[PDB]
Amino acid sequence: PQETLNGGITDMLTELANFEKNVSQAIHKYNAYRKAASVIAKYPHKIKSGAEAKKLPGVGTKIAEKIDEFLATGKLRKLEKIRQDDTSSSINFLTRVSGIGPSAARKFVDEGIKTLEDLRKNEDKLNHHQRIGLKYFGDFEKRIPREEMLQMQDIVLNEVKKVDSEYIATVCGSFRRGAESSGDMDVLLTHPSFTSESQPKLLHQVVEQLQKVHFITDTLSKGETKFMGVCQLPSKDEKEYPHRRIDIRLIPKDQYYCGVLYFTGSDIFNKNMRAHALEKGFTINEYTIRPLGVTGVAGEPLPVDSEKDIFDYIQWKYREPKDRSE
DNA sequence: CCGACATCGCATCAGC
DNA sequence: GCTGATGCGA
DNA sequence: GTCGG
Ligand SMILES: Nc1ccn([C@H]2C[C@H](O)[C@@H](COP(=O)(O)NP(=O)(O)OP(=O)(O)O)O2)c(=O)n1
Ligand SMILES: [Mn+2]
Ligand SMILES: [Mn+2]
Ligand code: NA
Ligand code: NA
């Protein structure tokens, strides 16, 4: 649908979502507003009343009431007031820095630290992750053209197999869903000598190699199965590429497809699949799917030899990654 | 009137 | 020293 | 905030 049909309303709900998330520290209200904004974005009519939007799943009394005020007056006083509030705005803005959540943002603002310049004046008071998020603040909010994502994929696929021929690196996330641009790169790593039943430094060597060739530039978090960090394409003396976020995850190779499914997403989709499963007598996570039982006590896990397998167990139509936006 | 809305890895904090 | 809780994030 | 127990 043309976004201007109910663009005023979806914007309003999205702002409210971000504020509940970053300032009120209520993730479920953030999700509620998101859900209401999303479903309205699909509505192929121009909303005339709150009671009309009330019909859509995820729109209840409070939001329908807020829509009525917006249509009848062109704004939302609560949203107008929040926007002029120095404290709420600062807290909200600071959470745009990677590593800074609602708790840290609130405490920063409480001690007068409110801008990026304030943060730069106070490196002492930031932890390692936050410093990096601050350093590449602009870059991390840049979107990554798919062409560059392909360039980034080449490097990873190359260096991965260079360490050991039987690794299997799989770019998931928005990229796998075929998006024209991505927020970051998500790499899913698997190796034969690592199973659920089950060679140790399996993730570490790959990361080390990507640092070796100067592809990985910074580390946010690193462990046995999880990597969170920063990368950069090498420049062709023509100008330099932005620093990008990259997540790497080493997963039980015999659970490869539940992982590919989870880390391909989307965000709402993974959520809808798990919630559906429950209404239908199943429970999925990133590793297993397992039929809860009669009583709803999980039974044993199943074999899965392709993504479609999981789609079959609860039997939705196998939707291509491109289709899993919700 | 009121609880679910998923769960996890890693960094760091609170405390023994 | 350690375990467990919290924060932030995927 | 919304849905549904
Ligand atoms: N809260 C979250 C966060 C991430 N995820 C999963 C699904 C996402 O596809 C995946 C990766 O996170 P992600 O990189 O943040 N999003 P995703 O790659 O979809 O989109 P982008 O912003 O990168 O473009 O992990 C999730 O299921 N629930
Ligand atoms: Mn991503
Ligand atoms: Mn990611
Ligand atoms: Na409704
Ligand atoms: Na943040």
PDB file of N, CA and C in Angstrom, chain A residues 153-198:
ATOM      1  N   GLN A 153      30.643 -10.781   1.474  1.00  0.00           N
ATOM      2  CA  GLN A 153      30.426 -12.222   1.451  1.00  0.00           C
ATOM      3  C   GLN A 153      31.627 -12.945   0.853  1.00  0.00           C
ATOM      4  N   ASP A 154      32.123 -12.423  -0.268  1.00  0.00           N
ATOM      5  CA  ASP A 154      33.284 -12.985  -0.954  1.00  0.00           C
ATOM      6  C   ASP A 154      34.463 -13.170  -0.010  1.00  0.00           C
ATOM      7  N   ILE A 155      34.779 -12.117   0.737  1.00  0.00           N
ATOM      8  CA  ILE A 155      35.889 -12.137   1.681  1.00  0.00           C
ATOM      9  C   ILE A 155      35.698 -13.213   2.747  1.00  0.00           C
ATOM     10  N   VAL A 156      34.512 -13.248   3.347  1.00  0.00           N
ATOM     11  CA  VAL A 156      34.214 -14.226   4.388  1.00  0.00           C
ATOM     12  C   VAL A 156      34.310 -15.650   3.853  1.00  0.00           C
ATOM     13  N   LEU A 157      33.590 -15.934   2.771  1.00  0.00           N
ATOM     14  CA  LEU A 157      33.624 -17.254   2.143  1.00  0.00           C
ATOM     15  C   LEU A 157      35.049 -17.676   1.793  1.00  0.00           C
ATOM     16  N   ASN A 158      35.840 -16.722   1.312  1.00  0.00           N
ATOM     17  CA  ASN A 158      37.234 -16.973   0.968  1.00  0.00           C
ATOM     18  C   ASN A 158      38.056 -17.391   2.183  1.00  0.00           C
ATOM     19  N   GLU A 159      38.149 -16.492   3.160  1.00  0.00           N
ATOM     20  CA  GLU A 159      38.987 -16.705   4.337  1.00  0.00           C
ATOM     21  C   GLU A 159      38.514 -17.877   5.190  1.00  0.00           C
ATOM     22  N   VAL A 160      37.201 -18.091   5.231  1.00  0.00           N
ATOM     23  CA  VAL A 160      36.631 -19.214   5.968  1.00  0.00           C
ATOM     24  C   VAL A 160      37.220 -20.536   5.484  1.00  0.00           C
ATOM     25  N   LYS A 161      37.121 -20.794   4.183  1.00  0.00           N
ATOM     26  CA  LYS A 161      37.593 -22.050   3.612  1.00  0.00           C
ATOM     27  C   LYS A 161      39.116 -22.134   3.650  1.00  0.00           C
ATOM     28  N   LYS A 162      39.764 -20.976   3.694  1.00  0.00           N
ATOM     29  CA  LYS A 162      41.217 -20.923   3.787  1.00  0.00           C
ATOM     30  C   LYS A 162      41.690 -21.512   5.112  1.00  0.00           C
ATOM     31  N   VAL A 163      40.924 -21.296   6.177  1.00  0.00           N
ATOM     32  CA  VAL A 163      41.297 -21.856   7.471  1.00  0.00           C
ATOM     33  C   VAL A 163      41.054 -23.363   7.464  1.00  0.00           C
ATOM     34  N   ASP A 164      39.890 -23.776   6.969  1.00  0.00           N
ATOM     35  CA  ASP A 164      39.520 -25.188   6.958  1.00  0.00           C
ATOM     36  C   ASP A 164      38.396 -25.435   5.949  1.00  0.00           C
ATOM     37  N   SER A 165      38.644 -26.354   5.019  1.00  0.00           N
ATOM     38  CA  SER A 165      37.762 -26.592   3.877  1.00  0.00           C
ATOM     39  C   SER A 165      36.347 -27.046   4.233  1.00  0.00           C
ATOM     40  N   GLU A 166      36.137 -27.521   5.455  1.00  0.00           N
ATOM     41  CA  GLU A 166      34.826 -28.064   5.795  1.00  0.00           C
ATOM     42  C   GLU A 166      34.010 -27.182   6.744  1.00  0.00           C
ATOM     43  N   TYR A 167      34.447 -25.944   6.962  1.00  0.00           N
ATOM     44  CA  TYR A 167      33.542 -24.942   7.519  1.00  0.00           C
ATOM     45  C   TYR A 167      32.427 -24.710   6.513  1.00  0.00           C
ATOM     46  N   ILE A 168      31.277 -24.242   6.983  1.00  0.00           N
ATOM     47  CA  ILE A 168      30.222 -23.803   6.076  1.00  0.00           C
ATOM     48  C   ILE A 168      29.637 -22.479   6.561  1.00  0.00           C
ATOM     49  N   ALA A 169      30.127 -21.384   5.987  1.00  0.00           N
ATOM     50  CA  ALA A 169      29.637 -20.054   6.325  1.00  0.00           C
ATOM     51  C   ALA A 169      28.404 -19.719   5.497  1.00  0.00           C
ATOM     52  N   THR A 170      27.354 -19.258   6.167  1.00  0.00           N
ATOM     53  CA  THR A 170      26.096 -18.954   5.499  1.00  0.00           C
ATOM     54  C   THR A 170      25.563 -17.595   5.930  1.00  0.00           C
ATOM     55  N   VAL A 171      25.548 -16.641   5.005  1.00  0.00           N
ATOM     56  CA  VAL A 171      25.049 -15.334   5.320  1.00  0.00           C
ATOM     57  C   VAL A 171      23.543 -15.394   5.404  1.00  0.00           C
ATOM     58  N   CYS A 172      23.029 -14.979   6.546  1.00  0.00           N
ATOM     59  CA  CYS A 172      21.627 -15.006   6.846  1.00  0.00           C
ATOM     60  C   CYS A 172      21.116 -13.585   7.033  1.00  0.00           C
ATOM     61  N   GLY A 173      20.127 -13.386   7.881  1.00  0.00           N
ATOM     62  CA  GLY A 173      19.650 -12.045   8.127  1.00  0.00           C
ATOM     63  C   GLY A 173      18.907 -11.431   6.957  1.00  0.00           C
ATOM     64  N   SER A 174      18.854 -10.108   6.923  1.00  0.00           N
ATOM     65  CA  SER A 174      18.133  -9.418   5.859  1.00  0.00           C
ATOM     66  C   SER A 174      18.707  -9.757   4.489  1.00  0.00           C
ATOM     67  N   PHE A 175      20.015  -9.992   4.438  1.00  0.00           N
ATOM     68  CA  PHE A 175      20.686 -10.349   3.191  1.00  0.00           C
ATOM     69  C   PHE A 175      20.075 -11.594   2.564  1.00  0.00           C
ATOM     70  N   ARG A 176      19.872 -12.626   3.376  1.00  0.00           N
ATOM     71  CA  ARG A 176      19.317 -13.875   2.874  1.00  0.00           C
ATOM     72  C   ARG A 176      17.866 -13.683   2.449  1.00  0.00           C
ATOM     73  N   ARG A 177      17.190 -12.720   3.068  1.00  0.00           N
ATOM     74  CA  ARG A 177      15.826 -12.382   2.676  1.00  0.00           C
ATOM     75  C   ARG A 177      15.832 -11.513   1.417  1.00  0.00           C
ATOM     76  N   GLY A 178      17.025 -11.276   0.879  1.00  0.00           N
ATOM     77  CA  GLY A 178      17.182 -10.636  -0.415  1.00  0.00           C
ATOM     78  C   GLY A 178      17.005  -9.130  -0.438  1.00  0.00           C
ATOM     79  N   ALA A 179      17.067  -8.498   0.730  1.00  0.00           N
ATOM     80  CA  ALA A 179      16.885  -7.052   0.830  1.00  0.00           C
ATOM     81  C   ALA A 179      17.938  -6.298   0.023  1.00  0.00           C
ATOM     82  N   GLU A 180      17.516  -5.216  -0.626  1.00  0.00           N
ATOM     83  CA  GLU A 180      18.405  -4.418  -1.468  1.00  0.00           C
ATOM     84  C   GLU A 180      19.536  -3.790  -0.665  1.00  0.00           C
ATOM     85  N   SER A 181      19.286  -3.564   0.619  1.00  0.00           N
ATOM     86  CA  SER A 181      20.326  -3.115   1.533  1.00  0.00           C
ATOM     87  C   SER A 181      20.106  -3.747   2.901  1.00  0.00           C
ATOM     88  N   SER A 182      21.163  -3.814   3.701  1.00  0.00           N
ATOM     89  CA  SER A 182      21.083  -4.465   5.002  1.00  0.00           C
ATOM     90  C   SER A 182      21.610  -3.583   6.128  1.00  0.00           C
ATOM     91  N   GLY A 183      21.171  -3.878   7.347  1.00  0.00           N
ATOM     92  CA  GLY A 183      21.654  -3.175   8.520  1.00  0.00           C
ATOM     93  C   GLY A 183      23.040  -3.654   8.900  1.00  0.00           C
ATOM     94  N   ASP A 184      23.277  -4.950   8.725  1.00  0.00           N
ATOM     95  CA  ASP A 184      24.576  -5.541   9.020  1.00  0.00           C
ATOM     96  C   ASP A 184      24.769  -6.833   8.234  1.00  0.00           C
ATOM     97  N   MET A 185      25.803  -7.591   8.583  1.00  0.00           N
ATOM     98  CA  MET A 185      25.981  -8.922   8.020  1.00  0.00           C
ATOM     99  C   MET A 185      25.933  -9.978   9.116  1.00  0.00           C
ATOM    100  N   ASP A 186      25.098 -10.990   8.914  1.00  0.00           N
ATOM    101  CA  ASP A 186      24.985 -12.090   9.861  1.00  0.00           C
ATOM    102  C   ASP A 186      25.531 -13.373   9.247  1.00  0.00           C
ATOM    103  N   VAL A 187      26.613 -13.888   9.822  1.00  0.00           N
ATOM    104  CA  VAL A 187      27.232 -15.105   9.314  1.00  0.00           C
ATOM    105  C   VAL A 187      26.980 -16.286  10.246  1.00  0.00           C
ATOM    106  N   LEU A 188      26.474 -17.374   9.676  1.00  0.00           N
ATOM    107  CA  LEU A 188      26.197 -18.590  10.427  1.00  0.00           C
ATOM    108  C   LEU A 188      27.248 -19.651  10.106  1.00  0.00           C
ATOM    109  N   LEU A 189      28.028 -20.035  11.111  1.00  0.00           N
ATOM    110  CA  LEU A 189      29.169 -20.926  10.909  1.00  0.00           C
ATOM    111  C   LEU A 189      28.902 -22.346  11.402  1.00  0.00           C
ATOM    112  N   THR A 190      29.250 -23.339  10.585  1.00  0.00           N
ATOM    113  CA  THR A 190      29.119 -24.742  10.978  1.00  0.00           C
ATOM    114  C   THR A 190      30.342 -25.557  10.565  1.00  0.00           C
ATOM    115  N   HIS A 191      30.662 -26.568  11.368  1.00  0.00           N
ATOM    116  CA  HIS A 191      31.849 -27.391  11.163  1.00  0.00           C
ATOM    117  C   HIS A 191      31.539 -28.834  11.567  1.00  0.00           C
ATOM    118  N   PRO A 192      32.091 -29.824  10.838  1.00  0.00           N
ATOM    119  CA  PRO A 192      31.770 -31.224  11.148  1.00  0.00           C
ATOM    120  C   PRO A 192      32.128 -31.656  12.568  1.00  0.00           C
ATOM    121  N   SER A 193      33.224 -31.130  13.104  1.00  0.00           N
ATOM    122  CA  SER A 193      33.667 -31.520  14.436  1.00  0.00           C
ATOM    123  C   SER A 193      32.988 -30.691  15.525  1.00  0.00           C
ATOM    124  N   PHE A 194      31.731 -30.325  15.297  1.00  0.00           N
ATOM    125  CA  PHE A 194      30.946 -29.639  16.317  1.00  0.00           C
ATOM    126  C   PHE A 194      29.464 -29.957  16.179  1.00  0.00           C
ATOM    127  N   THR A 195      28.988 -30.851  17.037  1.00  0.00           N
ATOM    128  CA  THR A 195      27.601 -31.293  17.005  1.00  0.00           C
ATOM    129  C   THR A 195      26.952 -31.094  18.366  1.00  0.00           C
ATOM    130  N   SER A 196      25.650 -31.348  18.442  1.00  0.00           N
ATOM    131  CA  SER A 196      24.945 -31.286  19.716  1.00  0.00           C
ATOM    132  C   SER A 196      25.439 -32.400  20.632  1.00  0.00           C
ATOM    133  N   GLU A 197      25.794 -33.532  20.032  1.00  0.00           N
ATOM    134  CA  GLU A 197      26.372 -34.646  20.774  1.00  0.00           C
ATOM    135  C   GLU A 197      27.817 -34.343  21.153  1.00  0.00           C
ATOM    136  N   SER A 198      28.446 -33.464  20.383  1.00  0.00           N
ATOM    137  CA  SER A 198      29.855 -33.142  20.574  1.00  0.00           C
ATOM    138  C   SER A 198      30.049 -31.924  21.473  1.00  0.00           C
TER     139      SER A 198
END
